[PDB]
Ligand binder design. Structure first.
Ligand SMILES: [Ca+2]
Length: 306
């Protein structure tokens, strides 16, 4: 079979890892590595780089000619443990060496997710995987977002031909969150530091107590920057097949039909994805397609865009 978005104007991709691999290229035409590209995955031990899981994602993407999103340079979970007790100047050299290592090894990255979750999970904690390196990037600084500016500056320097993206959750569910995120975007745009705006859109962001008109209005606000939008980590819970179907019909089209949205990435489709307990998967354990996926195939084929 051909992937769902084979003939569409924008990609429909998915998180990739061992449980998501079966049939993957028969459905999806873009990928993000689920975990292997977090800095704690590669450099759990200082100065030894375990590229195995990341190379698996990249090699599969290349073999299938599908765009690769590198996930993720800077984040507040799954960072190396040993960096937390280094002095800021040494932490900074480690961050710069990580950015150089990824750019050397992976020259064909389609979208570089430089910072994830600046509003929600900055690298300011000293718990397990917290990183504790905010100060190595200038901290909040004068603008309140110095460390985000410094992350993007490093990305521009080390990846001079690569599209750079910011990513976060719980953005389009609130005008106030959208306006906070756009202030970070505005600061970045003073130095032309960012090329794309990501919003995750997990299930907990799209519940029906916020109308879809709110999300659509906040997409229009994000689009007014002139930058492409990407939906990065989309999922809908499936306590029953029918709840999952109803939610896909309600929510998915608002993002898919938005003219400034240039791709959607599902955050898994088979059991073992992040929201496994909430049954967000679209294929059951016995390999059969759920009603939401039957619908999604037909909906996407009917909505190629441009
Ligand atoms: Ca190092």
């Amino acid at each position: 079979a051909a992937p769902l978005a084979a003939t569409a104007s924008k990609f429909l991709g998915c998180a990739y890892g061992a449980q998501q691999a079966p049939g993957f290229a028969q459905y999806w035409n873009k990928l993000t590595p689920e975990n292997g590209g977090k800095w704690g995955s590669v450099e759990a031990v200082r100065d030894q780089m375990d590229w195995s899981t990341l190379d698996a994602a990249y090699r599969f993407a290349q073999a299938n000619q599908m765009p690769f999103q590198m996930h993720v340079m800077v984040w507040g979970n799954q960072q190396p443990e040993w960096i937390k007790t280094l002095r800021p100047a040494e932490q900074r050299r480690e961050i710069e060496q990580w950015f150089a290592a990824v750019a050397q090894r992976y020259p064909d990255i389609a979208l570089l997710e430089v910072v994830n979750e600046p509003l929600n999970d900055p690298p300011s904690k000293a718990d397990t995987g917290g990183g504790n390196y905010l100060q190595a990037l200038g901290g909040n600084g004068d603008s309140g977002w110095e460390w985000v500016l410094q992350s993007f500056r490093l990305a521009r320097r080390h990846f001079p031909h690569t599209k750079l993206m910011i990513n976060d959750y719980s953005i389009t569910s609130s005008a106030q969150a959208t306006q906070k995120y756009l202030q970070i975007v505005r600061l970045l745009q003073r130095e032309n530091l960012v090329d794309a705006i990501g919003v995750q859109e997990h299930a907990f962001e799209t519940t029906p107590e916020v109308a879809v008109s709110v999300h659509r209005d906040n997409l229009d606000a994000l689009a007014a920057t002139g930058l492409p939008i990407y939906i990065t980590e989309f999922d809908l819970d499936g306590p029953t097949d029918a709840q999952q179907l109803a939610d896909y019909k309600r929510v998915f089209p608002v993002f898919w039909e938005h003219p400034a949205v240039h791709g959607i990435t599902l955050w898994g489709f088979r059991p073992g994805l992040w929201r496994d307990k909430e049954a967000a998967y679209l294929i059951r354990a016995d390999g059969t397609e759920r009603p939401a996926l039957t619908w999604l195939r037909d909906y996407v084929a009917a909505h190629p865009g441009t």
